[PDB]
């Protein structure tokens, strides 16, 4: 009875905490593409040491000089791609937060939570939370178990705070011999190999992939003929992720820090480090690591040299040379503007319709689980009709379904890119949409980031991550004026969201984006960096947008209710334009402007509310429009050589600092204290 | 390089933006615009409501 009651509240609450919102997965069943893990942390920790030891244990193979991605097998269905993010490039951090799904977050213990780590946590949180798992390094330096335990619990509690509570961390002793303790390495390995994932909108709506192998295609003779200034053909090797990419050339793909290059040629290759089931079924029908640009075994290839240790109606339709008439004649063996189709003569129609028997022949439980059932059923339809016929469907109309090695070759690529490329930085590329290729002005809403010191300023440059792109523009911050107009502000409100609008590459509404100040390591300074966070929420090609200017005038002769205002204007033309209008003296009494004058040339007369004083200042409200600056600058960090300290436009503060000016200031407008004496009357 | 060309274009655009943002505001963008602080007759010539 009582247990029955308690357990039914248990049942109800636990189901009501169980259920969620459905979204599709699109995800590969037959062959999952690799899952992506990124080692992320400050440079003075030893992520390399960690990646080396962990991969060696999992793969049963040592390795030195890791660089770029590195891909390994675990489990009977698991392949992983390991990425060591640099602790320098904020942009690289951004891209990793865009793409990676398991983030191995390594944090000092002798020193706690460097802000670079905290910023990566924030930006991942912003663009869509990937599964996070933290490891506290340097615990061995603490010379008392007291401090070790106290910092242990402190770290666990701050982490638990900033991500879901319960997110256990792994404590890492020390790098004795280029190695990490093997037993806890098993902890890590088994755990992340048995990790479970979630569907996220970015992944599951855009076909994205990390570039694995880098090669260039140019005739050397072409090189000397052109003079090294010729854009170079480029070939990329990689896997697929998330959304089935199309199979025919003629689509557009973003590349981080590169630009936006259309796809020229693409070919599908079987993977180099395949699944054990893939191998066994290969053998059944007939009868490990991989890291292209990093060393494997005992050998690393350079650009050319290497280093080694010492040791059918359908096709008739789709053919073009065939006229549709010859299609149809071959198949049985005009325009559309004429809406109703062709027919037969009326008598033949009637006589053949005297018989109508041939025409009587045709003639006469949880809702969440319910839509999840629709999703599952739709995907199983996808599966059966996909398996229906391969050579046309699989190869072409299904595109290139995820999890299939691909080589893609492109043109118009920067010589500087191919020359100053280094493997140490990650390189990403994912499908653009029509909305993400067309441009315009985005209306978004955003707030300063809450740990930031200073508030942003309208018409001040601002880098931002939004879509695969990441670029600097000049926003304009607008607050709706209690929902009548769109007045422009001049600063962001210091603890709330406010509207913004700026020119940029468009993208679908209800999409998070996160904006930053300087990216340059040279000036990171000592403060936080991520500055704004918001959602792009609509897109357009023009917006009405207002700034409030009030024409100030003064009275110079006063009767009861009438006045002659003397400096809101300078020409009878003007006052005739503005007459019969509505003004309010600073005192707060209304009135209307009524008639221009003659002998003075810009003075007019107003009919007010009461006897307006000479000691007032009359005002007239007015709406000017403002035009959004159209500055647009993709960062192209990887196109640059040093790959940090990229500098777009500078901010007004350091511009005034550089050219040595002083801040404008309306002196009399500056505030001051007023002491009005007590007043009496006659 | 064409990349260098577009760098030249963006660069010149950049200093133009810097100078344009550091110069004086436009009267019509200011507040408390007035007969002495405008250039004259601009309110006919322009359109505001």
């Amino acid at each position: 009875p009582g247990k029955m009651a308690r357990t039914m509240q248990r049942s109800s609450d636990v189901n009501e905490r169980k259920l969620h919102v459905p979204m599709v997965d699109r995800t590969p069943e037959d062959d999952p593409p690799p899952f992506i893990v990124a080692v992320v942390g400050p440079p003075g920790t030893g992520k390399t040491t960690l990646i080396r030891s962990l991969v060696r244990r999992m793969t049963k193979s040592t390795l030195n000089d890791i660089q770029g991605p590195i891909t390994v097998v675990s489990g009977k269905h698991r392949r992983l791609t390991f990425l060591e993010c640099p602790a320098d490039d904020l942009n690289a951090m951004i891209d990793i937060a865009k793409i990676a799904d398991l983030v191995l977050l390594l944090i000092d213990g002798n020193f706690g939570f460097e802000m670079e780590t905290m910023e990566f946590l924030n930006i991942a949180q912003h663009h869509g939370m990937p599964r996070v798992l933290g490891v506290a390094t340097h615990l061995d330096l603490f010379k008392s178990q007291s401090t070790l335990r106290a910092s242990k619990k402190r770290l666990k509690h701050r982490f638990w705070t900033e991500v879901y509570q319960g997110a256990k961390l792994f404590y890492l002793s020390g790098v004795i011999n280029g190695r990490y303790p093997d037993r806890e390495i098993l902890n890590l390995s088994r755990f992340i190999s048995v990790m479970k994932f979630r569907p996220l909108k970015w992944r599951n709506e855009h076909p994205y992939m990390l570039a694995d192998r880098f090669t260039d295609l140019t005739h050397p003779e072409l090189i000397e003929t052109q003079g090294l200034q010729i854009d170079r053909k480029v070939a990329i090797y990689g896997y697929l992720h998330g959304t089935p990419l199309p199979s025919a050339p003629g689509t557009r793909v973003h590349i981080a820090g590169v630009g936006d290059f259309s796809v020229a040629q693409i070919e599908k290759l079987p993977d180099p480090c395949p699944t054990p089931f893939y191998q066994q079924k290969l053998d059944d029908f007939e009868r490990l690591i991989y890291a292209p640009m990093s060393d494997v075994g005992g050998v690393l290839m350079d650009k050319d040299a290497v280093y080694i240790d010492i040791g059918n109606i359908g096709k008739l339709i789709y053919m073009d040379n065939i006229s549709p008439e010859e299609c149809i004649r071959r198949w049985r063996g005009v325009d559309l503007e004429k809406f109703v189709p062709y027919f037969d003569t009326f008598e033949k129609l009637a006589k053949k319709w005297k018989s109508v028997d041939a025409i009587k022949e045709r003639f006469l439980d949880t809702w969440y689980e319910l839509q999840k059932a629709k999703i599952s059923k739709q995907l199983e339809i996808n599966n059966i009709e996909y398996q229906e016929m391969t050579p046309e469907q699989r190869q072409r109309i299904e595109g290139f379904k995820a999890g299939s090695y691909v080589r893609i070759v492109f043109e118009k690529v920067p010589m500087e890119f191919v020359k100053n490329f280094n493997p140490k930085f990650p390189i990403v590329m994912g499908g653009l949409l029509p909305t993400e290729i067309k441009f315009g002005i985005v209306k978004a809403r955003l707030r300063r980031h809450r740990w930031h010191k200073k508030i942003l300023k309208t018409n001040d440059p601002l880098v931002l991550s939004l879509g695969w792109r990441r670029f600097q523009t000049l926003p304009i911050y607008t607050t709706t004026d209690s929902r009548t107009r769109t007045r422009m502000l001049k600063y962001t409100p210091e603890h709330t969201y406010c509207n913004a609008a700026f020119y940029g590459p468009l993208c679908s509404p209800n999409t998070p984006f996160c904006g930053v100040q300087i990216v340059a390591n040279s000036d990171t300074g000592n403060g936080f960096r991520i500055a704004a966070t918001g959602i792009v929420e609509e897109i357009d090609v023009n917006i009405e947008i207002v700034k409030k200017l009030k024409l100030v005038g003064f009275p110079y002769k006063i009767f009861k209710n009438t006045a002659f205002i003397k400096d809101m204007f300078s020409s009878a033309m003007e006052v005739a334009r503005f007459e019969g209008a509505q003004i309010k003296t600073v005192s707060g009494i209304r009135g209307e402007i009524k008639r221009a004058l003659s002998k003075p040339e810009g003075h007019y007369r107003a009919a007010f509310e009461d006897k307006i004083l000479m000691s007032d200042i009359v005002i007239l409200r007015s709406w000017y429009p403002v035009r959004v600056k159209k500055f647009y600058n993709p960062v192209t960090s990887l196109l640059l050589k040093e790959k940090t300290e990229w500098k777009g436009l500078r901010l007004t503060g350091q511009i005034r600092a550089a050219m040595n000016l002083e801040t404008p200031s309306n002196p009399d407008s500056a505030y001051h204290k007023i002491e009005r004496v007590e007043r009496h009357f006659n | 390089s064409s990349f260098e060309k577009q760098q030249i274009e963006i660069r010149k655009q950049i200093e133009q933006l810097e100078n344009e943002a550091v110069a004086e505001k436009k009267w019509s963008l200011k507040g408390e615009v007035k007969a002495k602080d405008r250039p004259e007759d601009a309110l006919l010539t322009e359109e505001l409501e």
Partner: peptide, 21 residues
């Protein structure tokens, strides 16, 4: 005199703008 002519031309310009645009 010439100032009157210049004011008249300016009036022509401003009035054309305001009555046409």
């Amino acid at each position: 005199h010439t100032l009157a002519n210049n004011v008249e031309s300016k009036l022509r310009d401003d009035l054309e703008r305001l009555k046409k645009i």
